[PDB]
Amino acid sequence: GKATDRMDAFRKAKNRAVHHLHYIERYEDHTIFHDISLRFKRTHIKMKKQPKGYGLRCHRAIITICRLIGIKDMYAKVSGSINMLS
Amino acid sequence: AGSRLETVGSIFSRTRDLVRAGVLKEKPLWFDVYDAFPPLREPVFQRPRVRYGKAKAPIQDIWYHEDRIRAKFYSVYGSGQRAFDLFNPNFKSTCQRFVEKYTELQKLGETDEEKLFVETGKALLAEGVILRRVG
Amino acid sequence: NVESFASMLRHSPLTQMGPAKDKLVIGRIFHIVENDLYIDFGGKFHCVCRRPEVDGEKYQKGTRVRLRLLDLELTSRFLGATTDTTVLEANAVLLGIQES
Amino acid sequence: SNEDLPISMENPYKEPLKKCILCGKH
Amino acid sequence: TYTEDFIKKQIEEFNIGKRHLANMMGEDPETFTQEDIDRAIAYLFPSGLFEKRARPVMKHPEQIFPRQRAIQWGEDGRPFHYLFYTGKQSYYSLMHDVYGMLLNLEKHQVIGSR
Amino acid sequence: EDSTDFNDKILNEPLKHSDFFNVKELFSVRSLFDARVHLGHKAGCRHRFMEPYIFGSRLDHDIIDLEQTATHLQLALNFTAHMAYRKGIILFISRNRQFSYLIENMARDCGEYAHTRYFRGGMLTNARLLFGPTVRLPDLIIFLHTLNNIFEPHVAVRDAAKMNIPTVGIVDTNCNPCLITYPVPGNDDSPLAVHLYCRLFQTAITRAKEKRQQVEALYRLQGQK
Ligand code: FES
Ligand SMILES: [Mg+2]
Structure with missing residues (x-):
């Protein structure tokens, strides 16, 4: 969301994200199905599957996204460029 | 709500998942019809690429055995005064008539093109066809 | 004993015609804008020939004429293009009027 | 099977390559 | 926005107020035209403002409120016009009618005006 | 209850x-061949994602290949009829100026809609602002010409997939069917083929509309007694 006032940028981004929703598949509704390793532009993300009780040990942003998705337990390591948008 | 991610998945996958998650309270009208009679290919967006190196398209040319005959007829004689009628599906051109006779004489047993080609022209001349050679 | 598509394509007039270069066909005028005459000759696209000066009156909608095709679709690829540029019409010469 | 299928053949209508006025001359 | 029900209530206030204004001036409510209304409103509410669109006015609601398009879809939700989703169903329905009359002519075959 | x-x-x-609705009796492989539905563009104009449907x-x-067009056209006609039977809004789109009049008439005859003019940005994604907040968008879109006048995909193909609207399209050898739900490989240039498509979609829709009135009349008549 972009605007001159900060309160107006929060609305645009918030109301526009519900129209671009994903659906994330979860293994037993607590973690991912398998280990993932990709590269978006220059940013490397290597996520790993973990059992129940492991918790979230990942970048603070990923911790905040995972709670929104519903992933309780997963490990992730970010390398390359730490850009919040990539 | 909804999902405007045209590149991610398809309208069916994106709608099937949101309905099952609870976001969409009512499934759209077309949904029940698509699940019953789905298309042959799932409409997923895929970016087109260029072919490099020795890669080539699998498309092949459509040739027939009678194309060798037509190429020679047009070279020896060429398209006659008679004009084609492409509208008429069951239309036979002067060249096509020459092919039918040329092939019919091949069934007899002649194994050479020169003699078989020459004999075919004579038959048409006997039938009244006009065959003016380029010369 | 239903005819297949491979048999229709083999015995079709267009298929057996071969290269359209210097082929005499018969077209039908279906639209006329000023002198321009839009003609259909059983192909994918039409051809736009200009009204002859000698006898133009006879060229009205429905009139059947004689053509000498040059190309079935005007295409060409130019510097920098990834695909051919098509004009969506054929190239032909208006010889005269067909009389039975 | 069917006999109306096309065949793997080279272009019959292909025209000979053009030559310069001096082709074959010294 | 002004609905059809609102306009219908404005038509009833003008008709009643048109009979009051004739009772004030001593005229016949029946033969009381709009020219007499403008003359009575300028005597009772005299305004010398140079802009005539800023003076007191008592006209018919069909001449005051701007014309508005009717509703284009019903309860079910289907529009009433086949060229609705163009956004200019009236302009294109006219261009479609004119271009249809130019095709018929081909088949079977100013001083004051501006 | x-x-x-x-x-x-x-x-x-x-x-x-x-x-x-018995739509397979409306056409045949020979009915399509006589309308020049098999004639495609040249090789240099060929699109990569249309090779599977090219006979040669x-x-x-x-x-x-008309053998595939029949199987693809059967699914599009069936899907089109089931949406008209369900009282769905069908919209026809084509930017070919030669057939603009023909298509607009068909939509009027079959009680459907058409958009053959310049497509203004936001007719679908920003509809509530253009028309109104209680507007109802189409439930099915039918593309008789998937390209615009500059030989590029129509913007509605992408905008329809954003709004989750299924599309039916007549894709030629120089078109992109990746985002078209029910594509029909066939000629989209000659007038003898466009008259067929319109005649087929106009009939499949008119049948379904009349087929529901018979099913309802029976249910209403049977329900009372
Ligand atoms: S072409 Fe110039 S020498 Fe053969
Ligand atoms: Mg095309």
């Missing part, structure tokens, strides 16, 4: 038959 029976007998019933190239002129 009555909606379940009303819904099942009317909506679910046609979904149990392979061909409820005769003298640098791609030939569309």
Whole structure:
């Protein structure tokens, strides 16, 4: 969301994200199905599957996204460029 | 709500998942019809690429055995005064008539093109066809 | 004993015609804008020939004429293009009027 | 099977390559 | 926005107020035209403002409120016009009618005006 | 208590038959060949994602395999009819100026809609602002010409997939069917083929509309007694 006032940028981004929703598949509704390793532009993300009780040990942003998705337990390591948008 | 991610998945996958998650309270009208009679290919967006190196398209040319005959007829004689009628599906051109006779004489047993080609022209001349050679 | 598509394509007039270069066909005028005459000759696209000066009156909608095709679709690829540029019409010469 | 299928053949209508006025001359 | 029900209530206030204004001036409510209304409103509410669109006015609601398009879809939700989703169903329905009359002519075959 | 029976007998019933409206009798492989539905563009204009539907190239002129068009056209006509039977909004789109009049008339005859003019940005994604907040968008879009006048995909193909609207399209050898739900490989240039498509979609829709009035009359008549 972009605007001159900060309160107006929060609305645009918030109301526009519900129209671009994903659906994330979860293994037993607590973690991912398998280990993932990709590269978006220059940013490397290597996520790993973990059992129940492991918790979230990942970048603070990923911790905040995972709670929104519903992933309780997963490990992730970010390398390359730490850009919040990539 | 909804999902405007045209590149991610398809309208069916994106709608099937949101309905099952609870976001969409009512499934759209077309949904029940698509699940019953789905298309042959799932409409997923895929970016087109260029072919490099020795890669080539699998498309092949459509040739027939009678194309060798037509190429020679047009070279020896060429398209006659008679004009084609492409509208008429069951239309036979002067060249096509020459092919039918040329092939019919091949069934007899002649194994050479020169003699078989020459004999075919004579038959048409006997039938009244006009065959003016380029010369 | 239903005819297949491979048999229709083999015995079709267009298929057996071969290269359209210097082929005499018969077209039908279906639209006329000023002198321009839009003609259909059983192909994918039409051809736009200009009204002859000698006898133009006879060229009205429905009139059947004689053509000498040059190309079935005007295409060409130019510097920098990834695909051919098509004009969506054929190239032909208006010889005269067909009389039975 | 069917006999109306096309065949793997080279272009019959292909025209000979053009030559310069001096082709074959010294 | 002004609905059809609102306009219908404005038509009833003008008709009643048109009979009051004739009772004030001593005229016949029946033969009381709009020219007499403008003359009575300028005597009772005299305004010398140079802009005539800023003076007191008592006209018919069909001449005051701007014309508005009717509703284009019903309860079910289907529009009433086949060229609705163009956004200019009236302009294109006219261009479609004119271009249809130019095709018929081909088949079977100013001083004051501006 | 009555909606379940009303819904099942009317909506679910046609979904149990392979061909409820009998649309396979409306056309044939020979009916398409006589309309020049097999004639495609040249090889240099060929699109990569249309190769599977190309039978071959005769003298640098791609030939569309009509055997696949029939199977693809059967699914589009069936899907089109089931949406008209369900009282869905159908919209026709084509930017070919040669056939703009023909298409606009067909939509009017079959009680459907058409958009053959310049497509203003936001007709679908920003509709509530252009028309109104209670507007109802189409439930099915039919592309008679998937390209615009600059030989590029129509913007509605992408905008329809954003709004989750299924699309039916007539894709030629120089088009992109990746985002078209039910594509029909066939010629989209000659007038003898466009008149056929319009005649087929106009008939499949008119049948379904009349088919529901018979199913409802029977249910209403049977319900009372
Ligand atoms: S072409 Fe110039 S020498 Fe053969
Ligand atoms: Mg095309």
